[PDB]
Every structure is written in C-alpha cells, then in structure tokens.
Structure 1
Amino acid sequence: LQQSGAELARPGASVKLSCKALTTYGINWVKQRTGQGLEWIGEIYPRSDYTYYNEKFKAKATLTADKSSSTAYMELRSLTSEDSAVYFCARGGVNSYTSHFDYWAQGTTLTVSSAKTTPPSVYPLAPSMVTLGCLVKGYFPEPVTVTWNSGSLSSGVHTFPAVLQSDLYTLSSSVTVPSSTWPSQTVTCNVAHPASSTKVDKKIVPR
C-alpha cells in the first residue's frame, strides 16, 4: 500500500487522502498524533461497497474507493488543529479466512494551520572519524526528508526529531565518515520539503 504526500490545510477546509493498493480485502484508516498511540477511523470493503466508521469520526471522515485504479480515499471535512496527525492505511481481512492489518502504507502527515508554508534554510556543519552535519531551520509544516549523497551514505547517519519554536520547525542531521575520505570524497546533505515543493542540497566543504 502507498499513500499520498504530506498536506497543509486551513481550519474549516477539507482534504482527501489516497491509499493505492480490493476485490477480497478492505482498507482501514488509522490516526496517530506525534508521540501518541493509534486510533481507528473506519474501514471500506470496496468489493461489497461496505463501510463502517468509528462513531467519533462519523461527522469528520468519508471513505470511498476507485476499484479500477485500486485506490482508496478518505476525505476529512471541517478541519481543526486536533486533526493534525499522521494518517495510515492498512489492509482489512475477512473473519478467520485471512490476515488483518497485514500491510500498512508509509502514512501521510496532515497539518491544519493558518501559518504559511516556509521552505527550510539548510546550513552546513563543517569542522580516525570526522562528523559533519546539516542544520535545517525555519520550515513549516512537517515533514522534511534528509539524505546524504542522495541516500548512498546511510551508515553513521543520525537525523533528529524536529522541534517547533515560534511556529517554525528546526532539526539537524549528522553523518560520520572516515577522516581520510573528507573532503577528498564529497559529502552532501539533501533536504526535501514536500509541502513547499522544494529540495535543497548542501555540499559540506572545510571552513
């Protein structure tokens, strides 16, 4: 299962999330707030046009599916700050005959806010092992994706959870490589910010 990209929405607006895979199995939607647990929204079994909602989400969520494109949708209406969360889809089983919640997509980050989208400022952190990094400052909303050398440098990476200060997020990422390999073998951080349609690469060069 694969989900649509991160969303920013205004208070009062609607959004429609997608989940691409439905002849036998259903689709469940699940909400998770940062650092909290899991809440079930509802299910659709497109085969038999069957839906069932958590009564808590009855007035919030509408589940539909396009059988031809094997895509399920969840429309969330009358959006509020409390709707800000990660939304997952997962497969729904059939009684004792199948697995249940057995394949989950990566999730979609939904932020409900009046604040404007702001791309990140990416600043290089340069000085047997050497540590480099990138400081990702002043972006809104979540998330950002940080890679090093487009994902070819993955050992020795630490990317930290963002913190929110004066309505803007900041995070840092470090990478540690053998000292003999930098700057001779280049090290570049790549910061993708889906909500602003922006990706920034910063090559780390000696000060």
Structure 2
Amino acid sequence: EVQLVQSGAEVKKPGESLKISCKGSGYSFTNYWISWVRQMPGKGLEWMGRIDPSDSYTNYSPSFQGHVTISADKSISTAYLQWSSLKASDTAMYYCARELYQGYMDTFDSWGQGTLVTVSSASTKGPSVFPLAPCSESTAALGCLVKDYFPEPVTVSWNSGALTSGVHTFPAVLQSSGLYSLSSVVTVPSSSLTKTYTCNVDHKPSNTKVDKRVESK
C-alpha cells in the first residue's frame, strides 16, 4: 500500500522552531516527488512547494519562498517541512503529498493524513463553564457556554453521555483574547424541565474537567 504518514499535532509559540515530517511506505521514495500543501482553518488548499527526494531539489511558491524550508531524508524515507521562526499566521493543517505523473501532468495521487499546527502566544488554560438557561412552549433549549480555553479541543457530553439526542455542540470561535469559546445546547420536551441536565466538559490539554448542572431557572 502506498502510504504517507505524518507526525503529530503541534502547539507552539511565535518565534519557535518546528520541523514536521512525512514518511512514505509502499513505494520507491526516491522515485516520486513530494509536495507540501497548507490548509488554513476554514480555507482552501495552498501549494507551498515540492522536492525530488533523490537529489533534494526543491521548488517553492513565490509566497512560501524563504519563509519555510522543505527537505528530504531518504535514509528512512521521510520528507520534512520546517520553520525557523513561527508566526501565528502559520496556524494551519499541513499535508504532504506524493506527486504521481500521469496524463502529462503531476497529480497528487496519495496524501498524508495531515498535521495540525497551532501557533499562538496564549498559554494552556482550562475553560470556565456557564449555564445557558432561558429567562423565566413546544421545545425548550438549554446549554453550556464553555469559555476561555486553550488550546482546542474540549469535548462536551450531557448527563454522562446518557443524552445525545438533540444536542448541538458548535465549532469553537477564537476570541480577541487568544482563547477559544464554544457553546453546547440541547433541545428537550418543555414538559421535562423533573429531568436534570448537566453538561460534562473535558479538557485534556489542561488535564481539567468541569460538570455544570443547568437549572431550569
């Protein structure tokens, strides 16, 4: 099986150095070029550059020119992407890709699974969790506001995973502060508010966990 596998996710501060990797297996590494592609959160794909692993010849986009160095180490069939000084603007998913020439063009026929790189001045912080209850019907909404954490992600469950139906946990937004925030809500029968509702908020990075009972009041 042709297969490119990338190193793990990174959380870094601006000014730091980073080298991420991509190891090919199931083919002749020196025989196929390797492209790197940036995908910013919510955005499309950006070709950064390429390299012929056999002699380490490199091509860069006029955009990524100089700001990033691509390299190859055929000793153990591994390609590299590296920065000397990261900026918060470098925050993105990064994919390595195998260039397979066919029909007279270079095609990205095989892709690594992606490396998430988050760059921020912020420091690790568990979230505060606030109830979302209606002021003083058909369906009724209640929720939890999970505020001021870093980095992503948190996971929310309701009533220890006992409640999954009708829950929406929204994608996190990045605040001015550099900290994330997100809401989780659930709609329930208005004749239940009887039933107790508690959101469980787990934040692995801060090794932290918060249960919040959401009172009908």
When the two structures are superposed, what TM-score results if normalisation uses the length of structure 2? 0.65
- 1:108 aligns with 116
Among 5, 12, 35, the residue aligned to 2:9: 5
Cα RMSD over matched residues?
A: 4.0
Distance in 2 (alpha carbons) for counterparts of 1:64 and 1:155: 48
| Aligned-pair identity (%) | 37
Query: For 2:68, which of 40, 57, 61 is the aligned residue?
Result: 61
- Checking the alignment, whether the CA contact within 8 Å between 1:9 and 1:15 is kept in structure 2 is no
Q: Distance in 1 between matches of 2:11 and 2:39?
A: 15
Amino acid at match of 1:5: A
Equivalent residue number for residue 92 of structure 1: 98
Superposition pairs for residues 130-141 of structure 1, below 5 Å?
130-140=140-150
**Do structure 1's residue 15 and structure 2's residue 18 form an aligned pair?**
yes
Note the 1:163-174 alignment, pairs <5 A: 163-174=174-185
| Residues 1:146 and 2:150 aligned together | no
TM-score by length of 1: 0.68
Aligned with 1:202: secondary structure?
strand
Pair member with larger Rg:
2
Which of 144, 167, 181 is the equivalent residue of 1:156?
A: 167
Q: Residue 38 of structure 1: CA displacement?
A: 3.1
Identify unmatched segments of 5+ residues in structure 2. Answer: none
SS of structure 2 residue aligned to 1:82: helix
**Residue type of the alignment partner of 1:123:** F
Summarize the Cα distance change of 1:39–1:50 in structure 2 as closer, same or farther, 3 Å threshold: same
Q: 1:167 to 1:88 in 2, by over 3 A?
A: closer
Equivalent pairs counted in the alignment come to: 201
- In structure 1, stretches of 5+ residues that fail to align are none
Check the 8 A contact 2:22/2:112 in 1, yes or no.
no
Report the alpha carbon displacement of residue 200 of structure 1 after superposing the two structures with TM: 2.4
Q: CA deviation at 1:89?
A: 0.7
